[model samples]
Target: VVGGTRAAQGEFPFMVRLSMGCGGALYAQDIVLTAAHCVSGSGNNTSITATGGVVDLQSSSAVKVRSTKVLQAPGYNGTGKDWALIKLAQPINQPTLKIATTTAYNQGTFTVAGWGANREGGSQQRYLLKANVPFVSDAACRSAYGNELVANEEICAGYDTGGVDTCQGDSGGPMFRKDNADEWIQVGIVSWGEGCARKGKYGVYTEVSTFASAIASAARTL
Candidate 1:
């Protein structure tokens, strides 16, 4: 998380740190929502650990659980359908992060939190960091990435002369905002970008609304 502030303990309780260097959110008691690229083809994954309940990675209060299985979006082909679900061996018991069921909530300043590098070529962070990025319209985003931007499957958020954006190790983290009821609802999943808050480049994320239904169904099977 570049150009961000340190998050307090349990501030974003749903935030999950994947042992393999990725971020995730607790979608349910045992279901972790993350980026498809963070994991290999969906199946049993006992080797991966899902740590949540604290912003500090080394906090003794952190809740760690092993993944029992994984369910990747069927259309995932590296460029689109970038979301995936990981079933934990046990429930983390944290308040789950609800996802936006529609695209209506994608127009505001969204909060992105992660333990990713603070700068390009930096090491992993010890604490969770957060920053806000205003919504970047599809037209403007397409102009920046050309044909590389996946329409519908992806969304963009960041400044044109970027200073704050998600970077390496932040993949699969949630880009959320508070709803009318003051509840945090996820609208995007950190997927990729040109660099760590580089000028003229925006951080690209998986449009969560596009696969909300599919994700819900897949989580049921998991």
Candidate 2:
């Protein structure tokens, strides 16, 4: 994420670091919720690894799990609903995250965390970074992307003045918000954007509320 501060250990326990590329969130003991673009060419290959628990990748307390299967969401055409669920070779002990099931979070502040790149074309950050970004309306998003912006199926969050957003390596990461109950819920899945922290260009995410069934089904069969 761009313009983010270093996240402390256990701050985002569900965050996953994909070895090949991108970030992800723990959907279950053995399932990871991520973006389809991150696993575009990942095939059924065994090279993909999911690291979690620790803020830094090289930390001794980090939990590393390998991938066994990749399940892309139904109707995922790349432009929208760009999400996937990856089954880990083994289950992780860390806590799994809850998805947003209501529109209660459709217009609130959000938090994004990842071990992705810090800047445009920059190298990945060794320590996990977390940033607070404000939600952007679909009208404002359409003004920036026009017909490219998908309604209902996607969500945008950033500042019109710039300086906060997800970068290349941050794809498939969790875009979450704290609900009225004070519990963190996954509201969006980091998908794509025009550029990192660019003015008027908010980061696009797979709207979690639209695909609640898809996510639940994936969690069951993945």
Candidate 3:
């Protein structure tokens, strides 16, 4: 929705800062959507702080600690079903996010934004990085990653060369495409890959379409 990749461009108002290590969008009140791999430590070990609007991590007024409630699909391993949610300590008035209505398969155009490293194996960008990516089919993704790559619960983006892809800190970021109404609907959550922006590897994401019902149910409880 906001133009460009950097959060300093006044688009940071819509983004949610991850307390753990990754970043994601705040889709609902007290609920921040992110990647499951970002979940570390033991039970109840996951904790996060979410700040409304653009927040400077160094600023005390900009940060607010929030406890996290994680939800991963039953089939989720580490690489697959890489979606999760964080519950803020207080409710936020951020813009509501729309879930994906259709699968982001084929060669559709989309965008990925995160604080991951710039370029391949580059240093992590303190601000967010934005890049355009193309959706690839299951067959093509599997061909790129081999049989170990599960397609049912995941979506693939980027080329085999990995000129543009999500990196380490980019996990749990949103992957969205514009709908017929011109609204950006999130289709995937950054999952994993062999390397950041590497050749012959695609950025894998959790297919939000497959978990629509689960997400909707979880949202209601939230």
Candidate 4:
């Protein structure tokens, strides 16, 4: 899940808020996984700092800083498969994030969180928003998005009624499901969508299962 909350939530420390950026999630202790586009502006060698909400955004007090290192997917562009791995200077002191290993949630239910504007093409806010999304098949997704929906490295999620969906500023949030163990395993990452909660359209996502090998390899390298 991805969204912003007060530093008092305790989880805020583990959640890194990027500068002029969006999305956040606990990938590992001190490590956050976000979209490559979010970090690509300054290339992969830049560093970003974050602070607690209690601390004044303009003051030096009560702020926690960390250096950032980004790992962009080899062929990633603004299209499908847009993702990245960000390493933090300090550990977040939280449980490891559960990642999905198989594309087994085709018809399952899941949830998504983000700190985007309540409306499409709108400004962002501090509060995190969340909603329920139903998984869609590749065929159905392609029928809606056509060439825009590439299935090899992505999946789709949303509802026909458009009651819930991902939007801008939510590009890197986790799309997760509760397993039999009641554990929330991240199955996808917010990649793209036609708009915020639009009818007949669905949100496209990076299939975590498709990158399991890369994720495992990257994790070991770190």
TM-score (all chains, Cα) for each model: 0.98, 0.96, 0.84, 0.83
Between candidates 1 and 3, name the one with more favorable lDDT. Answer: 1
User: What CA root-mean-square deviation does each model show from the true structure?
Assistant: 0.7, 1.4, 3.4, 3.9
Tens digits of lDDT, candidate 4, 122-168: 77656555677889888888888898877977888888777577788
Q: Candidate 4: count the clashes.
A: 2
Tens digit of per-residue lDDT, candidate 1, span 50-124: 998888888898889999998899978788899999999899988999999999898899999999999988998
Model 3 CA lDDT for position 27? 72
Residue-by-residue lDDT tens digits, candidate 2, 42-81: 3465678999888889999888999988888777766787
> How well does candidate 3 match the true structure in TM-score terms?
0.84
Worst 10 residues of 4 by lDDT: 1-10
TM value for model 1: 0.98
lDDT of 3: 0.69
Q: State the C-alpha lDDT per candidate.
A: 0.93, 0.87, 0.69, 0.67
Q: Which stretches of candidate 4 lie over 4 Å from their true place?
A: 1-16, 41-44, 50-64
What is residue 190's positional error in candidate 1, in angstroms?
Answer: 0.3
Better of 2 and 4 by lDDT: 2
The local distance difference test score of model 4 is: 0.67
